[PDB]
Amino acid sequence: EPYPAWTADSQSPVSIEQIEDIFIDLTNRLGFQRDSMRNMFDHFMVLLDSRSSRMSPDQALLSLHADYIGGDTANYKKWYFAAQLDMDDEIGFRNMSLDNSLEAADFRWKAKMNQLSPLERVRHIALYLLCWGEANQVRFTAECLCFIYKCALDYLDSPLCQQRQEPMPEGDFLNRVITPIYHFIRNQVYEIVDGRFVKRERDHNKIVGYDDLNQLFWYPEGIAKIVLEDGTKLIELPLEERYLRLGDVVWDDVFFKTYKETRTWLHLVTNFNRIWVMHISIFWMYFAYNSPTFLAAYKWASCALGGTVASLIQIVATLCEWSFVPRKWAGAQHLSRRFWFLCIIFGINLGPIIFVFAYDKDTVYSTAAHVVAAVMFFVAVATIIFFSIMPLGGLFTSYMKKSTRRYVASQTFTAAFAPLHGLDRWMSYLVWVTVFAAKYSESYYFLVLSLRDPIRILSTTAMRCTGEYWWGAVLCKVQPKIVLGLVIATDFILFFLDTYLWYIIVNTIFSVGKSFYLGISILTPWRNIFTRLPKRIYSKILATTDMEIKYKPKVLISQVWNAIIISMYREHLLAIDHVQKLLYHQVPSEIEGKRTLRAPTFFVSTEFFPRDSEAERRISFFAQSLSTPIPEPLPVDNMPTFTVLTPHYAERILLSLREIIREDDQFSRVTLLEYLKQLHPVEWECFVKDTKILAEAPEYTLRTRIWASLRSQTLYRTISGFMNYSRAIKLLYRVENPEIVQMFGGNAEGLERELEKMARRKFKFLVSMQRLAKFKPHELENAEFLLRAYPDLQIAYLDEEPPLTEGEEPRIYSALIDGHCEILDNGRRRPKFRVQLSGNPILGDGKSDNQNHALIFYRGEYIQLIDANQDNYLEECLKIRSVLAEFEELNVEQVNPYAPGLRYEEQTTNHPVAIVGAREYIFVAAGKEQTFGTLFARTLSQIGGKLHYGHPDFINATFMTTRGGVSKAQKGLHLNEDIYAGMNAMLRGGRIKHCEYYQCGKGEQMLSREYYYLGTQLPVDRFLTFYYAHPGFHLNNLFIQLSLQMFMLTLVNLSSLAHESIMCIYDRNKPKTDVLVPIGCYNFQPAVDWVRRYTLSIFIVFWIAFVPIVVQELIERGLWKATQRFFCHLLSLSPMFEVFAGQIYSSALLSDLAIPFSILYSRFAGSAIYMGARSMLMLLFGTVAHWQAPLLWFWASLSSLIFAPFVFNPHQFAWEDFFLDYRDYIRWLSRGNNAHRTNLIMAEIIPCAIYAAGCFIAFTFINAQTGVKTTDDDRVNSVLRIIICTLAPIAVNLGVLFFCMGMSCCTGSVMAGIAHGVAVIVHIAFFIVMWVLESFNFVRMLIGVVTCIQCQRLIFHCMTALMLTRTQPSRELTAKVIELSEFAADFVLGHVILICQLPLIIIPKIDKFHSIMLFWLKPSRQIRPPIYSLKQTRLRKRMVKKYCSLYFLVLAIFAGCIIGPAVASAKIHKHIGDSLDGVVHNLFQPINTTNNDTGSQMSTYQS
Ligand SMILES: CCCCCCCCCC(=O)O[C@H](COC(=O)CCCCCCC)COP(=O)(O)OCCN
Ligand SMILES: CCCCCCCCCCCCCC
Ligand SMILES: CCCCCCCCCCCC
Ligand SMILES: CCCCCCCCCCCC
Ligand SMILES: CCCCCCCCCCCC
Ligand SMILES: CCCCCCCCCC
Ligand SMILES: CCCCCCCCCC
Ligand SMILES: CCCCCCCCCC
Ligand SMILES: CCCCCCCCCC
Ligand SMILES: CCCCCCCCCC
Ligand SMILES: CCCCCCCCCC
Ligand SMILES: CCCCCCCCC
Ligand SMILES: CCCCCCCCC
Ligand SMILES: CCCCCCCCC
Ligand SMILES: CCCCCCCCC
Ligand SMILES: CCCCCCCCC
Ligand SMILES: CCCCCCCCC
Ligand SMILES: CCCCCCCCC
Ligand SMILES: CCCCCCC
Ligand SMILES: CCCCCCC
Ligand SMILES: CCCCCCC
Ligand SMILES: CCCCCCC
Ligand SMILES: CCCCCCC
Ligand SMILES: CCCCCCC
Ligand SMILES: CCCCCCC
């Protein structure tokens, strides 16, 4: 019989017959499609049934009306206010606070709904539901539905439709008002070609999407732009006849783009404008204070001028924003007003600084200098504090007039946030106060106060040296100032890493203190969880407090504890003797004869779980989760009905049979069974035994099919894993009320029948099987099999039909089939419903439009949406009605929302809860467990809010389906198609909370739109928390990588300068004996010691930030290993060992993030191998010139970067596989064959030449000899040595290239060989000429090479890009020049890589250890082929020895190139050149000089 909570009562305001009457009439007079009417009717009635099982039926209808259309939660009310009667500013004013006007209209609206007869509310809701059901693929645009809904509602109330004695034909609401909008959307992509559609490839910024499609309807002036077909405006017409001619509007002259994103670096300045301000500005002031080398008023004046940078940053953000919104669109004048205000602020700030900067040089004004300095210091501080807070999108809004728009974005649709009151408010305040009060305090004593001494030295010391021939000694005269500038620049970056460093520390402290203070789970009282289980189950999983008839509080627990255990055994996890001691046995009372209840000995105080199998894990976790304070549940008779969605494109329903054996030694290992059998060798044992009892044929094949199916990874395991929701309800139904079984005790069939009837109305399952009309006949059998297995299952699939007349698109439907539908002659079952779409719905990339077409059949109140790989064990399935109570809607009181008084200040249900994420963070001896518990949290809490912000598991269906959809996927917008739903619900009113006693069981977006709305309007509480989770992580891995490069640039110069000095011996105790004992010397010892204080502070940030991803990637073991690992270091190298114990994880992780040599090289290059190569060279130059002690710390790390991927490879290292890998490498090498425009050319030039010049400066200084006491006419003219060696090899390229053209004019593979043959030797030769030029001095030769390489790539970097910007004969040469020159570079770098393994192949037994190492990491079903024919063996040995000799030859010539000039360094003694007149002393002047003119000498000049 039908819905037994609305009909089976006697106080229902209406009758089920009246509802059908209303639906029939409403369909009749608007032409809705006939079957969707039945669908929506069933949906509505099920909704009423569910809502009326925990309240009076008089209130269910009221609550539904309030929630859909009319309450403070309904979307229709929001749109009606914001558009139909303006009043958008008032909502923003009221939000920031926490006749006409807002109170009056609100009162009128509230009092106009308080007097509706209960037969009108049903009509309203029915109309809305019908409109929502019909509109295909327009559900993504909420406000459109509101517009059509209002138009239809106004039309039906007219005296024009009530007198017309004729109903419009069916399909008149889909072929007249809905289809044109769809034709507009599909016409922005998929341009029609001669017969079909193809993906129209337009630029990503001329394509209107959904977000730009509905956003027209937010503003009153956005509606007034709807031109009709003739030319008149739609609004011009009266209200009643505004619906009929809605099919004549042309939706192609009426939609614009309204966002138009731009270059990526340009957003990060307007979005996150509060992080640059609080960092740059304060950073300025610190150095401005303690830098007296440029009285007492100048100091304060400068530190005050520090405050003028904040306003400048605000102005360049406002000005940058002006290129996002359109020109005349709503909210544009506010930008000009704000620009005016900010200009005034900037003027006020930097007005008087000029007056105090120089107007006081010993005149009578000094009485008025200090006062203005101090007051403007205070003003600057006030400005900084004001701009660090008060979001950019809302300031200077009180001082504005009425105007038209006082805000730039709608404040009722993108600025409605949850106020987050309670206790967590103070906690967030405290956290973000301590972080920034610790960082600003410690980053002044370790980073600006310890840098105070070198500033005085390196800013006054003046060099004395001859110089060069083109400018003399004007550039080399001030080297130290450049070093100081580079030191400050490379230290400015670390100020940004410091914050994220402290944010990790203070979070985990606050978590431990909060999880220990509240006295929850003190350390580990482990021998108590099992001791007191029964009191946990009886009051957390059973609802007895409101069940009464209290009797026997232990017979109930017995009925449960056996069910959970037996289920484990039925899955072949426990032995038959292994369960009898793990179950409530009942023993008869020997006194009288009746039965009594015992308890397992395990359960009060012998291998309960075999070799800690997973069966232990399931029980263990279940036992701990009952300590958390779970809310008390409701009776299983009064819970809401929910549903489950699953999308499925193309998976495996079953592993078939032929794909179980296949061929053995043709792929990984052997037949699949034996692979599966070995992994679980305690189940197959129990399995075959279970077969024997059953056998005590196709069924056996089926049983093997299922047995394998439950393992591996398929679709059958998810369905059978989630269908435990069905049993968990039934079992808890009988237990709760045992008087229901006494009624018909003896009817075993009657009992089970009733139990099923309940579970089929509180739980629905639905999968969305796309493309089901075109399955292969071998795969269609699998689909039908599921229907036979679980009859209560629902499948939704698309369909087709030949076109009505020849030449048109075929109509497509979307029908569902149940498990009880009768079969037809064809074989497929007859569907229950069949709805008509308006064209192909699949338009996006991912599986997000798959969900939408099957969302119509979602009967229920809440939704749990899953992918096709989940487990959901039964023990984590019993407590479903406790997690479902997180939505605070189960224990409340109704208050008649339409009531006089009760203004919107003191209501309760204002921000409903939308998403509920689930638990995902799965988990000296006494000290070790405590410490390992602490290290657990630091790993734990790092991802507690990084991969857990919007990950959805349960969705409040009513709230989340009226405003948008469940997920969106478009070519234009790009977030992740998974996090988009999370952010959208936050900035629209909803709220997100997550439980912690459940098992989920599972940049290109900084360019997006939601980042613009979130980062410009959020308060500072939530902004900082938001910034340091998603954006501040990716933007942190870029600063560390950028800090390293800025460190190499300053290392080169610092060591170069250190290779020229006397250093004035220095003591690190208290060197205040200002005597400077070399007398005539200039000291640089403190500057050199700065390298020591940096390396320490750069691996700490590398340490803490890369420890928490260890355990979240290597939780598997370690505690057992830690004992022996500690056992090997009670007397080991300790602090230094920690250094070399902290350099391996980088090798470990990147290996897991990742075979012939060439194919691995080509994909691992361009990001890790090249930048590492250059940085390797610069470090080498430094380590030879001065050799600071703690410099090898980089040698380990930099080596590990480019030496790890070639040690974590599989068996490829023995003897000849190495050499045969050398076969194809050469063969592959032989056949490798590889203002709107003033922004792209500026972004890829500036930070590619600065790095070049910095190297170039160093080379000039190292040649200009200092302390040499020579004359003016000496010079070196070292600039030329760059030119003679930088462009000369490029000239050799073209000359041969032209001669290549000529020779053929006056074999292609051969011609490549000779071309590439000399393209390599030319560079190798020019490496030699540079060495000779510097008179055979290795130290001052390296820096020469480094400069040339940087200079070379600068030419290529700019020349190619400009040519692309801007001819064919010119361009065709360009690519050929760059290609072959780049070739020689890749050859040498590639070749040297496989040369540094010679002292690893000499060891006889090598891969044996290599095998042991890698198999520890992971097993991958290894296979070893013994395929070596007699003729293969001889040739294999034959050909391998061919290149094994060749390999050694190229090794010898490379070393020979080195030793050549090295041994010729004692043969030339006179000189190498004596030319003059511009090339004078060109090669290198000295052969014998001195650099120690100090001591006795008092005053010489040595210019
Ligand atoms: C003395 C012998 C060497 C002569 C080297 C001639 C380079 C000639 C110019 C060139 O090829 O310079 C670079 C490549 O530099 C390098 O290999 C630098 C490392 C060299 C290690 C030598 C070890 C002995 C091009 O880099 P890309 O533009 O490819 O970088 C963007 C991503 N595609
Ligand atoms: C005030 C600080 C300015 C820092 C500018 C750094 C620019 C980037 C230098 C390195 C670019 C990449 C070189 C390969
Ligand atoms: C009662 C007022 C409390 C204000 C808390 C502000 C916290 C700001 C943190 C960041 C400062 C730069
Ligand atoms: C007269 C002395 C001028 C010194 C200028 C130093 C500029 C350093 C810039 C560093 C940029 C990374
Ligand atoms: C006072 C003499 C100044 C000579 C020019 C200095 C240019 C420095 C440029 C630094 C770029 C990193
Ligand atoms: C003021 C800082 C501007 C942001 C710099 C971002 C550099 C990386 C862009 C990819
Ligand atoms: C804007 C700078 C104001 C300076 C005031 C000076 C007054 C001088 C009075 C003698
Ligand atoms: C919060 C970090 C503080 C570090 C110490 C600063 C004061 C040192 C005084 C000796
Ligand atoms: C967290 C703020 C700590 C402030 C310490 C001030 C310096 C220590 C005393 C010299
Ligand atoms: C001249 C000092 C050389 C020190 C060793 C350089 C190479 C280190 C490789 C680990
Ligand atoms: C001039 C001092 C050189 C010290 C070299 C130390 C070598 C350590 C190799 C690991
Ligand atoms: C010794 C004080 C220097 C200036 C500190 C400014 C702090 C601003 C928050
Ligand atoms: C560093 C100043 C950048 C200014 C960009 C202006 C862009 C206007 C469209
Ligand atoms: C001698 C009186 C000086 C007053 C200066 C006032 C400055 C206000 C910004
Ligand atoms: C010579 C020191 C004068 C300090 C004046 C301070 C005024 C603060 C309002
Ligand atoms: C931001 C206030 C604390 C840091 C500056 C004052 C103390 C310096 C030692
Ligand atoms: C970036 C934080 C540096 C902390 C250095 C502490 C040194 C202790 C010996
Ligand atoms: C302060 C502006 C810096 C712009 C750098 C652009 C880099 C693009 C890759
Ligand atoms: C560190 C800022 C010094 C500014 C001096 C201006 C003359
Ligand atoms: C722009 C800061 C320096 C001003 C100098 C005025 C004499
Ligand atoms: C000398 C005191 C140092 C304290 C360091 C705390 C991190
Ligand atoms: C006299 C100007 C010299 C500029 C040198 C730039 C590298
Ligand atoms: C010469 C005064 C210091 C200059 C620093 C530039 C960053
Ligand atoms: C300080 C910003 C530097 C950006 C460098 C981009 C390569
Ligand atoms: C006449 C100045 C020449 C400068 C050359 C810089 C590469």
User: Nearest ligand to the C-alpha of residue 442?
Assistant: 8
Instruction: State the distance from the centre of ligand 4 to the C-alpha of 288, rounded, in angstroms.
Output: 16
Residues 6+ apart with CB under 8 A from 219: 83, 88, 330, 410
- Which of the 8 DSSP states describes residue 823? B
SS3 content of the chain, % helix, strand, coil (to 5): 50, 5, 45
**Beta pairing, strands 197-198 & 191-192:** antiparallel
Instruction: State the distance from the centre of ligand 17 to the C-alpha of 498, rounded, in angstroms.
Output: 11
Mutate-to-test residue for ligand 19 from 290, 291, 294, highest number of ligand atoms within 8 A of CB: 294
Does the Cβ of 444 fall within 6 Å of ligand 16? yes
DSSP per residue, 903-955: -TTS-S-SS---EEE-------HHHHHHHHHHHHHHHHHHSTTTS-SS--SEE
- How far apart are the C-alpha atoms of 1440 and 1460, rounded to whole Å? 31
HSE value, Cβ hemisphere, 13 Å, CA-based, for 1127: 6
Atom 8 of ligand 16, residue of closest alpha carbon: 441
User: Nearest ligand to the C-alpha of residue 434?
Assistant: 9
Does the Cβ of 355 fall within 6 Å of ligand 7? yes
Enumerate the β-bridge partners of residue 768.
Answer: 647, 796
Domain boundaries, the chain: 1-134, 534-624, 1278-1383+1445-1487
User: Nearest ligand to the C-alpha of residue 474?
Assistant: 5
Does the Cβ of 440 fall within 6 Å of ligand 16? yes
- How far apart are the C-alpha atoms of 1274 and 1503, rounded to whole Å? 11
How many CB atoms within 10 Å of residue 1054?
A: 25
- How far apart are the C-alpha atoms of 1296 and 1314, rounded to whole Å? 10
**Beta pairing, strands 833-836 & 595-597:** unpaired
User: What 3-state DSSP class applies to 1066?
Assistant: coil
Instruction: State the distance from the centre of ligand 2 to the C-alpha of 1242, rounded, in angstroms.
Output: 14
User: What 3-state DSSP class applies to 875?
Assistant: coil
Instruction: State the distance from the centre of ligand 15 to the C-alpha of 375, rounded, in angstroms.
Output: 8
Instruction: For residue 192, give the H/E element and its range.
Output: strand 191-192
Mutate-to-test residue for ligand 15 from 366, 370, 377, highest number of ligand atoms within 8 A of CB: 370
DSSP per residue, 1394-1455: TTTTHHHHSSSS-HHHHHHHHHHH------------HHHHHHHHHHHHHHHHHHHHHHHHHH
Does the Cβ of 446 fall within 6 Å of ligand 17? yes
Residues 6+ apart with CB under 8 A from 84: 150, 220
Atom of ligand 6 nearest to the CA of 265: 9
Enumerate the β-bridge partners of residue 864.
Answer: 644, 954
Atom 11 of ligand 2, residue of closest alpha carbon: 1247
Does the Cβ of 359 fall within 6 Å of ligand 20? no
Taken in order 1166, 1170, 1171, 1172, the sign of the CA dihedral is positive
How many CB atoms within 10 Å of residue 1458?
A: 12
Per-residue tokens: 296: 């007492």
Residues 6+ apart with CB under 8 A from 698: none
Instruction: State the distance from the centre of ligand 19 to the C-alpha of 288, rounded, in angstroms.
Output: 7
> With contact defined as beta carbons under 8 Å apart, do 954 and 128 qualify?
no
How many CB atoms within 10 Å of residue 1141?
A: 13
Instruction: State the distance from the centre of ligand 2 to the C-alpha of 1254, rounded, in angstroms.
Output: 11
Opening angle at CA 162, ends 160 and 165, nearest 5: 100
- How far apart are the C-alpha atoms of 284 and 377, rounded to whole Å? 13
Atom 1 of ligand 7, residue of closest alpha carbon: 352
Distances in whole angstroms, Cα of residue 1061 to Cα of each of 1084, 1260, 1498: 8, 16, 18
Distances in whole angstroms, Cα of residue 165 to Cα of each of 25, 1118, 1243: 13, 82, 70
Atom 2 of ligand 19, residue of closest alpha carbon: 288
Q: Return the biggest CA–CA distance within the chain.
A: 128
Instruction: State the distance from the centre of ligand 21 to the C-alpha of 447, rounded, in angstroms.
Output: 14
Nearest to 350, CA basis, from 301, 389, 395, 316: 301
Which residues' Cβ are closer than 6 Å to ligand 1?
1166, 1170, 1173-1174, 1323, 1327, 1349, 1352-1353, 1356, 1381-1382, 1384-1385, 1388-1389
Instruction: State the distance from the centre of ligand 5 to the C-alpha of 323, rounded, in angstroms.
Output: 35
> With contact defined as beta carbons under 8 Å apart, do 457 and 1087 qualify?
yes
Does the Cβ of 485 fall within 6 Å of ligand 23? yes
Taken in order 154, 157, 162, 166, the sign of the CA dihedral is positive
Report resolution in angstroms: 3.4
- How far apart are the C-alpha atoms of 900 and 373, rounded to whole Å? 60
Long-range contacts of 873-876 (CB under 8 A, 24+ apart): 873/618, 873/721, 873/724, 873/999, 874/564, 874/567, 874/724, 874/727, 874/728, 875/564, 875/618, 875/619, 875/622, 876/622, 876/998, 876/999
Does the Cβ of 288 fall within 6 Å of ligand 19? yes
Atom 6 of ligand 20, residue of closest alpha carbon: 354
User: Nearest ligand to the C-alpha of residue 289?
Assistant: 12
How many CB atoms within 10 Å of residue 253?
A: 9
Interrupted backbone of the chain, residues before each interruption (C–N > 2.5 Å)? 98, 294, 605, 696, 923, 1002, 1154, 1234, 1306, 1366
Atom 1 of ligand 15, residue of closest alpha carbon: 370
Atom 7 of ligand 12, residue of closest alpha carbon: 282
Per-residue tokens: 644: 């489950």
Residues 6+ apart with CB under 8 A from 1405: none
Distances in whole angstroms, Cα of residue 875 to Cα of each of 559, 727, 755, 866: 14, 11, 20, 19
> With contact defined as beta carbons under 8 Å apart, do 1016 and 270 qualify?
yes
Residue 785's Cα: distance from chain center in Å? 39
**Beta pairing, strands 915-917 & 833-836:** unpaired
- How far apart are the C-alpha atoms of 1275 and 1264, rounded to whole Å? 8
- How far apart are the C-alpha atoms of 1226 and 1224, rounded to whole Å? 5
Distances in whole angstroms, Cα of residue 1322 to Cα of each of 1226, 1316, 1350, 1380, 1453: 20, 10, 18, 12, 15
Nearest to 768, CA basis, from 792, 800, 797: 797
Per-residue tokens: 962: 């009226």
The backbone region for 768, taken as left when phi is positive above 0, alpha when psi lies in -120 to 50, beta otherwise, is beta
Residues 6+ apart with CB under 8 A from 953: 864, 865, 915, 916, 917, 918, 998, 1000
Does the Cβ of 489 fall within 6 Å of ligand 4? yes
Residue 531's Cα: distance from chain center in Å? 43
Residue whose token pair is 């009246």: 18
- How far apart are the C-alpha atoms of 157 and 204, rounded to whole Å? 44
Opening angle at CA 1320, ends 1315 and 1326, nearest 5: 125
Per-residue tokens: 180: 């044109």
In single-letter form, the type of residue at position 1032 comes to G
Enumerate the β-bridge partners of residue 836.
Answer: 813
> With contact defined as beta carbons under 8 Å apart, do 341 and 383 qualify?
no
Instruction: State the distance from the centre of ligand 23 to the C-alpha of 291, rounded, in angstroms.
Output: 10
Residues 6+ apart with CB under 8 A from 1133: none
Atom of ligand 16 nearest to the CA of 437: 1
Burial annotation 54-81 (CB, 10 A radius, 16+ → b, else e): beebebbbbbbbbbbbbbbbbbbbbbbb
Does the Cβ of 501 fall within 6 Å of ligand 5? no
> With contact defined as beta carbons under 8 Å apart, do 349 and 379 qualify?
yes
Burial of 275 (0-12, 13-18, 19+ CB in 10 A): buried
Atom 3 of ligand 12, residue of closest alpha carbon: 286
**Beta pairing, strands 813-817 & 833-836:** antiparallel
Per-residue tokens: 1098: 């750069």
Nearest to 836, CA basis, from 130, 168, 25, 174: 174
Distances in whole angstroms, Cα of residue 1253 to Cα of each of 1257, 1341, 1498: 6, 17, 37
Does the Cβ of 357 fall within 6 Å of ligand 20? yes
Atom of ligand 2 nearest to the CA of 1042: 10
Does the Cβ of 498 fall within 6 Å of ligand 17? yes
Atom 3 of ligand 19, residue of closest alpha carbon: 294
Instruction: For residue 596, give the H/E element and its range.
Output: strand 595-597
- How far apart are the C-alpha atoms of 1232 and 720, rounded to whole Å? 51
Instruction: State the distance from the centre of ligand 3 to the C-alpha of 433, rounded, in angstroms.
Output: 6
- How far apart are the C-alpha atoms of 663 and 670, rounded to whole Å? 7
- How far apart are the C-alpha atoms of 130 and 605, rounded to whole Å? 62
Instruction: State the distance from the centre of ligand 21 to the C-alpha of 496, rounded, in angstroms.
Output: 21
Helical ranges in 943-1084 per DSSP H:
957-962, 980-986, 1010-1017, 1020-1027, 1031-1034, 1036-1058
User: What 3-state DSSP class applies to 956?
Assistant: strand
Instruction: State the distance from the centre of ligand 23 to the C-alpha of 312, rounded, in angstroms.
Output: 21
Helices 494-517 and 1085-1104 pack at an angle, to 10 degrees, of 40
Burial of 616 (0-12, 13-18, 19+ CB in 10 A): middle
Atom 4 of ligand 20, residue of closest alpha carbon: 354
Instruction: State the distance from the centre of ligand 15 to the C-alpha of 298, rounded, in angstroms.
Output: 15
Atom 2 of ligand 3, residue of closest alpha carbon: 429
Atom of ligand 6 nearest to the CA of 1038: 8
Burial of 492 (0-12, 13-18, 19+ CB in 10 A): middle
Atom of ligand 12 nearest to the CA of 385: 9
Atom 5 of ligand 14, residue of closest alpha carbon: 372
Distances in whole angstroms, Cα of residue 366 to Cα of each of 295, 356, 357, 359, 375: 12, 10, 12, 9, 15
Alpha carbon dihedral 1061, 1065, 1067, 1071, in 10-degree steps, equals -100
- How far apart are the C-alpha atoms of 858 and 966, rounded to whole Å? 12
Distances in whole angstroms, Cα of residue 449 to Cα of each of 276, 444, 454: 23, 6, 11
User: Nearest ligand to the C-alpha of residue 1255?
Assistant: 5
DSSP per residue, 201-268: ---TTS---HHHHHGGGGSHHHHTT-B-SSS-BGGGS-SGGGTGGGGS--TTSS---S-----GGGHH
> With contact defined as beta carbons under 8 Å apart, do 477 and 465 qualify?
yes
How many CB atoms within 10 Å of residue 1013?
A: 19
Distances in whole angstroms, Cα of residue 286 to Cα of each of 298, 304, 435, 445, 1467: 15, 11, 19, 11, 57
How many CB atoms within 10 Å of residue 240?
A: 16
User: Nearest ligand to the C-alpha of residue 1387?
Assistant: 1
